Design a protein around this ligand. Structure first.
Ligand SMILES: N=C(N)N1CCC[C@H]1C(=O)N1CCN(C(=O)N2C[C@H](CO)C[C@H](C(=O)Nc3ccc(Cl)c(F)c3)C2)CC1
Ligand SMILES: *[C@@H]1O[C@H](CO)[C@@H](O)[C@H](O)[C@H]1NC(C)=O
Ligand SMILES: *[C@@H]1O[C@H](CO)[C@@H](O)[C@H](O)[C@H]1NC(C)=O
Ligand SMILES: *[C@@H]1O[C@H](CO)[C@@H](O)[C@H](O)[C@H]1NC(C)=O
Ligand SMILES: *[C@@H]1O[C@H](CO)[C@@H](O)[C@H](O)[C@H]1NC(C)=O
Ligand SMILES: *[C@@H]1O[C@H](CO)[C@@H](O)[C@H](O)[C@H]1NC(C)=O
Ligand SMILES: *[C@@H]1O[C@H](CO)[C@@H](O)[C@H](O)[C@H]1NC(C)=O
Ligand SMILES: *[C@@H]1O[C@H](CO)[C@@H](O)[C@H](O)[C@H]1NC(C)=O
Ligand SMILES: *[C@@H]1O[C@H](CO)[C@@H](O)[C@H](O)[C@H]1NC(C)=O
Ligand SMILES: *[C@@H]1O[C@H](CO)[C@@H](O)[C@H](O)[C@H]1NC(C)=O
Length: 341
């Protein structure tokens, strides 16, 4: 059993259904093979390996897959890019992400870190090997990570470098909080998301506790994003093919008193989007008729820390995504590819 750190082209595997018209199944049918019928996980005795989730080529490869998936599935009525405009066809699609497995070809293996407290960087003491990752749903979103896996013990704070304020922080929850979003059947663009504020505020208290530990028992304060475009100032995500933008100010107010019922976030279905794939603008068709509803699990939070305040008494955090690679990272963090030397 000898190996060395290496990079290589992965392949993908899924349980896509060949009869399904849903666009993730369509994509997986022709670009992935069926998932491993008998997956095998070999434990490595007294092996210690070093991982680095911020420098992991698997993330880059998943990003390209999802870009390609979106480019052949959600085609927009009009793409505006670098001076050129292109009008295409934009029929309403069936959209519901499915888990994708990433798998190494012959000569390579995936090492899997099984330390329950692992924060993404540093040495792992409980390593296994696998031919494929577990199945990861490629959920595109900002501010909140949805429908992901949970941390197994305590809330985990993940950052390439906590001291650097421009480094995005990933909070990995150990308890999911449901967010239930609805555009009622009968303003067709107006919608809302319902969160159990009791559940949310309690989990958010535990996040502050955890952030305290890393920040010298200082005063932890949350605040809405300090400007930017709507995809970053709002919790943005796609629901049955429709782009939802949800004001999360009520989630990131430190108030929490008589605040512990249901939190209704005001939302909008937008037709003009600032693409996350490549720089540009895409215009999609107005929303389908009827009740549009998505019930998801908040499994993590994307946070950006306010810079320039070392001699202040407190650290403020704001929600902030946009770089979808961090979404992939929050699930690939325990994997790394190695060449069997
Ligand atoms: N891809 C690579 N390799 N890179 C290199 C560094 C920068 C990045 C890059 O090159 N790019 C990233 C995206 N790019 C933007 O421009 N973004 C700015 C935009 C606000 O202006 C929002 C964008 C958004 O998150 N969109 C969004 C849309 C729908 C949903 Cl559902 C959603 F969750 C999110 C972020 C351009 C290319
Ligand atoms: C290591 O991880 C394995 C999962 O592969 C699990 O049995 C447990 O969390 C750990 N056990 C040992 C013996 O390290
Ligand atoms: C992650 O754990 C390593 C220990 O190997 C430590 O050096 C690093 O600072 C930790 N990072 C965070 C964000 O806790
Ligand atoms: C949401 O989380 C619950 C428990 O936290 C889990 O049983 C359920 O499968 C999750 N749903 C999705 C869609 O991931
Ligand atoms: C989640 O982690 C926090 C510490 O970050 C801990 O206080 C809490 O009890 C944990 N909850 C579960 C269900 O593991
Ligand atoms: C982390 O960021 C701080 C501030 O930007 C920097 O001074 C420090 O050297 C960084 N640490 C590493 C290991 O890069
Ligand atoms: C989600 O909210 C809608 C409208 O508020 C409601 O009709 C539906 O039953 C809710 N679903 C769940 C699973 O809570
Ligand atoms: C909200 O969550 C709490 C604790 O998780 C639960 O006890 C309560 O019943 C929930 N409220 C509603 C309206 O479901
Ligand atoms: C979100 O709602 C708050 C309160 O209604 C408002 O002040 C804020 O400007 C809203 N955010 C955006 C991006 O519109
Ligand atoms: C999360 O998973 C549920 C259950 O599979 C699905 O109905 C929902 O639309 C998903 N949410 C997102 C944003 O993909």
């Amino acid at each position: 059993p000898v190996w060395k750190d290496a990079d290589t082209t992965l392949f993908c595997a899924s349980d896509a259904k060949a009869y399904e018209t849903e666009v993730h199944n369509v994509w997986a049918t022709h670009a992935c093979v069926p998932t491993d019928p008998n997956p095998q996980e070999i434990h490595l005795e007294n092996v210690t390996e070093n991982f680095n989730m911020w420098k992991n080529n698997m993330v880059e490869q998943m990003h390209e897959d999802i870009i390609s998936l979106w480019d052949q599935s959600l085609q927009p009525c009009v793409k505006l890019t670098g001076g050129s405009v292109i009008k295409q066809a934009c029929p309403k699609i069936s959209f519901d992400p499915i888990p994708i497995h990433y798998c190494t070809p012959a000569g390579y293996v995936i090492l899997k870190c099984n330390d329950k407290n692992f924060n993404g960087t540093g040495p792992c003491k409980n390593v296994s090997s696998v031919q494929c990752t577990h199945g990861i749903k490629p959920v595109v979103s900002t501010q909140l990570l949805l429908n992901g896996s949970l941390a197994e013990e305590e809330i985990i704070i993940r950052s390439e470098n906590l001291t650097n304020n421009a480094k995005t922080i990933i909070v990995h929850l150990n308890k999911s909080v449901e967010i239930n979003c609805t555009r009622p059947s009968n303003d067709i663009r107006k919608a809302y998301c319902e969160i159990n504020g009791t559940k949310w505020n309690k989990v958010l208290k535990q996040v502050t506790e955890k952030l305290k530990e890393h920040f010298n028992n200082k005063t932890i304060i949350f605040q809405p994003p300090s400007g930017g475009d709507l995809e970053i100032t709002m919790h943005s995500f796609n629901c049955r093919g429709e782009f939802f933008y949800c004001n999360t100010t009520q989630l990131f107010n430190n108030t929490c008193k008589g605040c512990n019922g249901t939190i209704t976030l005001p939302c909008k279905i937008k037709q003009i989007i600032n693409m996350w794939q490549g720089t540009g603008q895409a215009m999609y068709a107005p929303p389908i008729d009827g009740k549009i509803n998505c019930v998801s699990n908040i499994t993590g939070i994307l946070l950006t820390r306010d810079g320039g305040a070392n001699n202040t008494s407190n650290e403020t955090f704001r929600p902030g995504g946009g770089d979808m690679r961090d979404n992939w990272r929050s699930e690939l963090y325990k994997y790394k590819v190695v060449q069997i030397e």
